[PDB]
Amino acid sequence: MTESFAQLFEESLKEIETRPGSIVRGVVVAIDKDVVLVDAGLKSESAIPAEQFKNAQGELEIQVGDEVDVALDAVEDGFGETLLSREKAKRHEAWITLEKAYEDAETVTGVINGKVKGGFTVELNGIRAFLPGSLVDVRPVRDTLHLEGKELEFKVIKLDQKRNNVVVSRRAV
Amino acid sequence: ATVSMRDMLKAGVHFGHQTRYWNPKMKPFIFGARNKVHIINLEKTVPMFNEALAELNKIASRKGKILFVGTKRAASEAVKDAALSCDQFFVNHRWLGGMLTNWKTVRQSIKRLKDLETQSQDGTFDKLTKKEALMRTRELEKLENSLGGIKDMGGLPDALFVIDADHEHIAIKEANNLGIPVFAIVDTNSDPDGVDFVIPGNDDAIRAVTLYLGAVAATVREGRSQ
Amino acid sequence: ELQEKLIAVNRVSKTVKGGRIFSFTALTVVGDGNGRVGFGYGKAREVPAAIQKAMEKARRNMINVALNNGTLQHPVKGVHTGSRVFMQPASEGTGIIAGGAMRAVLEVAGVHNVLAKAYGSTNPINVVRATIDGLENMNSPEMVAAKRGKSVEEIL
RNA sequence: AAGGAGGUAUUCAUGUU
RNA sequence: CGCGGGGUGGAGCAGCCUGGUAGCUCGUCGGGCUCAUAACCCGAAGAUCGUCGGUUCAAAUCCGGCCCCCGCAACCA
RNA sequence: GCGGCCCCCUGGACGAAGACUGACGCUCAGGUGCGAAAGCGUGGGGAGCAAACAGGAUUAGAUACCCUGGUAGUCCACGCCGUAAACGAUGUCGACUUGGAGGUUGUGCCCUUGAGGCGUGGCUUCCGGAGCUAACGCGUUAAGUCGACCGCCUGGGGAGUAC
RNA sequence: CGUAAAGCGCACGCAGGCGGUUUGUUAAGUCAGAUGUGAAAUCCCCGGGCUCAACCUGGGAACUGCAUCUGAUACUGGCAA
Numbered sequence: 001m002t003e004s005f006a007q008l009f010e011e012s013l014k015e016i017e018t019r020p021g022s023i024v025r026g027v028v029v030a031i032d033k034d035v036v037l038v039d040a041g042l043k044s045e046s047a048i049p050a051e052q053f054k055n056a057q058g059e060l061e062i063q064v065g066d067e068v069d070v071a072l073d074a075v076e077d078g079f080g081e082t083l084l085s086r087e088k089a090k091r092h093e094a095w096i097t098l099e100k101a102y103e104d105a106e107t108v109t110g111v112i113n114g115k116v117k118g119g120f121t122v123e124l125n126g127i128r129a130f131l132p133g134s135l136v137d138v139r140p141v142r143d144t145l146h147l148e149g150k151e152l153e154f155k156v157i158k159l160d161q162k163r164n165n166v167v168v169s170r171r172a173v
Numbered sequence: 174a175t176v177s178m179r180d181m182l183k184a185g186v187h188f189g190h191q192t193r194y195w196n197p198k199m200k201p202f203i204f205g206a207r208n209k210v211h212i213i214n215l216e217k218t219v220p221m222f223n224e225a226l227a228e229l230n231k232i233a234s235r236k237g238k239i240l241f242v243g244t245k246r247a248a249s250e251a252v253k254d255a256a257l258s259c260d261q262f263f264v265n266h267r268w269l270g271g272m273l274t275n276w277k278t279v280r281q282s283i284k285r286l287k288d289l290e291t292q293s294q295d296g297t298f299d300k301l302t303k304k305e306a307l308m309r310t311r312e313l314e315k316l317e318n319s320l321g322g323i324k325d326m327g328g329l330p331d332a333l334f335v336i337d338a339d340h341e342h343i344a345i346k347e348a349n350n351l352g353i354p355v356f357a358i359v360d361t362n363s364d365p366d367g368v369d370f371v372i373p374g375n376d377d378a379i380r381a382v383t384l385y386l387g388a389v390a391a392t393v394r395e396g397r398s399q
Numbered sequence: 400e401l402q403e404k405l406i407a408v409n410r411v412s413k414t415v416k417g418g419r420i421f422s423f424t425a426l427t428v429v430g431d432g433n434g435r436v437g438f439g440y441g442k443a444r445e446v447p448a449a450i451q452k453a454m455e456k457a458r459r460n461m462i463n464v465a466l467n468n469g470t471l472q473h474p475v476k477g478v479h480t481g482s483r484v485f486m487q488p489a490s491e492g493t494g495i496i497a498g499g500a501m502r503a504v505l506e507v508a509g510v511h512n513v514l515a516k517a518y519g520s521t522n523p524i525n526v527v528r529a530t531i532d533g534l535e536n537m538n539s540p541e542m543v544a545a546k547r548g549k550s551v552e553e554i555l
Numbered sequence: 556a557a558g559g560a561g562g563u564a565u566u567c568a569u570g571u572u
Numbered sequence: 573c574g575c576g577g578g579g580u581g582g583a584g585c586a587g588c589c590u591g592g593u594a595g596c597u598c599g600u601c602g603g604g605c606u607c608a609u610a611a612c613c614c615g616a617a618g619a620u621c622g623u624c625g626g627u628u629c630a631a632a633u634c635c636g637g638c639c640c641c642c643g644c645a646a647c648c649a
Numbered sequence: 650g651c652g653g654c655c656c657c658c659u660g661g662a663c664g665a666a667g668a669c670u671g672a673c674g675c676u677c678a679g680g681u682g683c684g685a686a687a688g689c690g691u692g693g694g695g696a697g698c699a700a701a702c703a704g705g706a707u708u709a710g711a712u713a714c715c716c717u718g719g720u721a722g723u724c725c726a727c728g729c730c731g732u733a734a735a736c737g738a739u740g741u742c743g744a745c746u747u748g749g750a751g752g753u754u755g756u757g758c759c760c761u762u763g764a765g766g767c768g769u770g771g772c773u774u775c776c777g778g779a780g781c782u783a784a785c786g787c788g789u790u791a792a793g794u795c796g797a798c799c800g801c802c803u804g805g806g807g808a809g810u811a812c
Numbered sequence: 813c814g815u816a817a818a819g820c821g822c823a824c825g826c827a828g829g830c831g832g833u834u835u836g837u838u839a840a841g842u843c844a845g846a847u848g849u850g851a852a853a854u855c856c857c858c859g860g861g862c863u864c865a866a867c868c869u870g871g872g873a874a875c876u877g878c879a880u881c882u883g884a885u886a887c888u889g890g891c892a893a
């Protein structure tokens with residue numbers, strides 16, 4: 001039957017969004033020794049390095065037929081390449097987990113590695129946080145260089161993720 | 174066997190390149206531009222696809238030697254698979270400049286490949302003072318990689334099915350020079366002037382490539398079997 | 400069956416570090432008389448090899464020309480790099496009146512009666528190419544009637 | 556003057572300085 | 573010996589006239605084809621153009637010599 | 650050709666919406682005007698720079714390059730001169746012919762979802778298709794396809810010289 | 813006529829050249845026909861006479877023009893809206 005191309009493309013457009021930056025899940029067609037090929041249904045399949053897919057333990061928890069959610073860099077790189085980066089999705093999920101952990105205030109870690117305006121600053125896999133000048137540690141600690149260079153093991157209280165800021169505080173933990 | 178329009182949409186044929194790299198000769202085969210990316214009008218694609226299939230069936234019935242040209246790393250394995258499925262010839266790796274026009278030199282290369290493979294396997298002389306054995310094996314492997322598909326073609330092909338006309342422009346030019354029907358799938362950035370049976374569609378997607386190859390393989394198999 | 404004739408042989412130089420390296424270029428034209436004509440241009444260190452290469456090239460890349468009783472169908476102009484060429488369908492019995500390279504090309508093509516003149520440059524290579532192009536850009540009464548959607552009697 | 560990095564180059568909280 | 577004609581992959585044939593381009597069929601091999609043969613299709617191999625020369629930028633082609641082959645040539649008691 | 654800021658006088662261009670006149674248009678030989686720099690006349694001004702000139706060097710020579718000085722001039726007012734690689738080495742006007750990336754200046758719409766999205770003009774830089782070109786290259790700002798008018802060329806020197 | 817010779821340094825502008833679109837009218841340009849003339853010789857065509865030819869010669873055609881008259885009104889021009 002003559003269901004027009006315009007009307008059919010309308011439904012297909014409604015199914016999938018082409019906005020850059022957003023995250024959509026794609027079936028992994030195959031894995032080579034250093035790259036993973038992911039089909040998200042766009043113009044073409046993406047070729048993401050396996051190091052990105054490699055887990056914290058240097059292993060490939062991913063597999064054929066697995067579904068994982070990948071952030072959309074662009075529809076085309078100029079060579080018909082649907083550039084997709086799942087580590088951006090990892091960063092977005094980490095910001096969401098950081099927001100949850102700064103709302104729930106549970107135990108968490110992350111290498112406190114820099115100097116904030118108030119004091120020392122923390123970095124934790126997508127969480128750029130602060131431990132202030134007098135609040136780097138509870139006591140009068142010169143361990144802002146422990147809050148700049150050593151992992152803070154605490155909760156987060158106040159965070160502005162859009163500002164790339166959190167409070168990796170000298171809290172109860 | 175034809176392909177349904179919903180299947181084409183699922184494959185992702187409608188998608189094209191960005192609206193800055195488009196070729197103005199592909200303007201008729203364009204529906205719209207969503208987010209600075211061209212949308213190919215499948216309303217023209219479906220009838221043209223079936224027309225190209227009919228011509229391919231005619232050639233296959235007349236026992237023509239089809240050549241499947243595809244060099245994109247996405248389409249290399251699929252082109253080889255389709256050509257072997259339909260017992261035809263393919264070029265999965267880089268198209269040698271003047272593969273068809275300089276057939277007299279390609280013929281000598283084929284003979285060299287045949288001699289090397291025959292001696293290595295059938296002749297099985299084994300002991301070749303190491304260094305020569307490694308060199309001969311490496312040369313045979315390279316020749317198999319380059320010309321393994323077309324080694325049994327004998328003469329010139331009667332039809333050239335080409336993936337991504339823009340990428341394989343050289344092969345299209347040689348086919349035009351010699352005189353050969355070309356069945357090329359043309360994205361928005363490609364130039365359809367050299368193609369005889371244009372098939373508007375996305376050459377990049379492996380889904381679309383597999384869809385195209387399956388349809389044409391079925392058609393040529395029907396034509397040959399008769 | 401294919402009548403062929405050599406128009407011009409020219410000596411050229413390359414001027415390499417050692418000295419000057421000379422080589423020969425051959426311009427040839429072949430044709431079947433019945434209407435097909437094709438030119439060839441070849442180059443080799445020696446004259447016989449150059450002529451043979453030119454003959455092979457000329458044998459390839461032929462073009463058909465619509466001939467009307469051994470002459471042209473209408474006055475036709477032809478242009479190229481320097482060569483501007485005019486050719487006229489003269490009456491039977493006049494013979495081929497043309498200058499040099501045009502004479503050779505028309506004779507092998509099979510036109511027996513034309514009035515031609517070469518304006519501009521008369522460089523053999525360019526004038527041969529221009530003459531062949533002009534012959535190509537010449538339609539017959541059947542062709543014009545078909546393209547215009549009429550009968551030959553309506554066109555006359 | 557020599558070497559390294561990033562880009563066509565900057566957004567990169569102000570504060571601090 | 574007289575005159576004429578001829579000699580082109582193994583065989584049978586074009587190409588000679590107009591000097592440039594070695595073709596067609598059978599046969600051989602391989603593959604496909606056929607269960608196989610056969611038939612059919614696709615490839616691959618095979619002459620240095622009888623030979624010796626001459627001419628020419630270039631000769632199966634033009635010219636000559638020689639070699640042969642064939643036809644015609646008047647002679648057997 | 651124009652470059653600090655402010656004021657006075659003044660020309661042109663472009664956009665929006667309309668209203669108006671109703672071919673009032675285009676080009677232009679002679680003619681008229683404007684026209685960098687250097688130069689000339691009269692009168693001022695004169696810091697810096699700087700032909701000429703002076704001296705010190707360099708060099709076989711150095712009537713130069715280099716260095717120390719330095720007058721016309723460079724600046725102002727009013728006249729004259731009327732020439733430049735005054736160049737996009739591309740006369741002016743108009744029409745038509747695939748595209749891309751920018752800049753600059755208007756303006757319409759879309760939720761300005763906040764710096765945005767989609768249009769629609771003017772001028773401007775680069776890349777490139779057909780086409781054209783001797784080639785180099787030009788390519789909607791043409792050197793493409795055409796129409797109107799004007800200027801100019803006819804081998805190199807002699808010579809943009811003589812009368 | 814960008815680089816081979818050739819776009820005035822640039823503008824304004826008289827004479828001059830060119831003129832968007834519709835209708836009417838005129839018939840100047842334009843076109844058609846006719847008449848007069850465009851000397852003869854020469855040129856060309858068909859013939860004829862010198863034994864042939866050159867040469868001579870009969871008839872035609874031509875002399876692309878100009879003038880007058882009668883028509884046509886698509887375009888250009890004039891006039892009117």
Ligand SMILES: [Mg+2]
Binds near residue numbers: 519
């Ligand atoms: Mg000339």
Ligand SMILES: [Mg+2]
């Ligand atoms: Mg003037």
Ligand SMILES: [Mg+2]
């Ligand atoms: Mg001055």
Ligand SMILES: [Mg+2]
């Ligand atoms: Mg003065």
Ligand SMILES: [Mg+2]
């Ligand atoms: Mg003074």
Ligand SMILES: [Mg+2]
């Ligand atoms: Mg000085």
Ligand SMILES: [Mg+2]
């Ligand atoms: Mg001084």
Ligand SMILES: [Mg+2]
């Ligand atoms: Mg001048």
Ligand SMILES: [Mg+2]
Binds near residue numbers: 735
């Ligand atoms: Mg200037």
Ligand SMILES: [Mg+2]
């Ligand atoms: Mg000039």
Ligand SMILES: [Mg+2]
């Ligand atoms: Mg003017």
Ligand SMILES: [Mg+2]
Binds near residue numbers: 777788
């Ligand atoms: Mg360009």
Ligand SMILES: [Mg+2]
């Ligand atoms: Mg003078």
Ligand SMILES: [Mg+2]
């Ligand atoms: Mg002068």
Ligand SMILES: [Mg+2]
């Ligand atoms: Mg010059």
Ligand SMILES: [Mg+2]
């Ligand atoms: Mg010049």
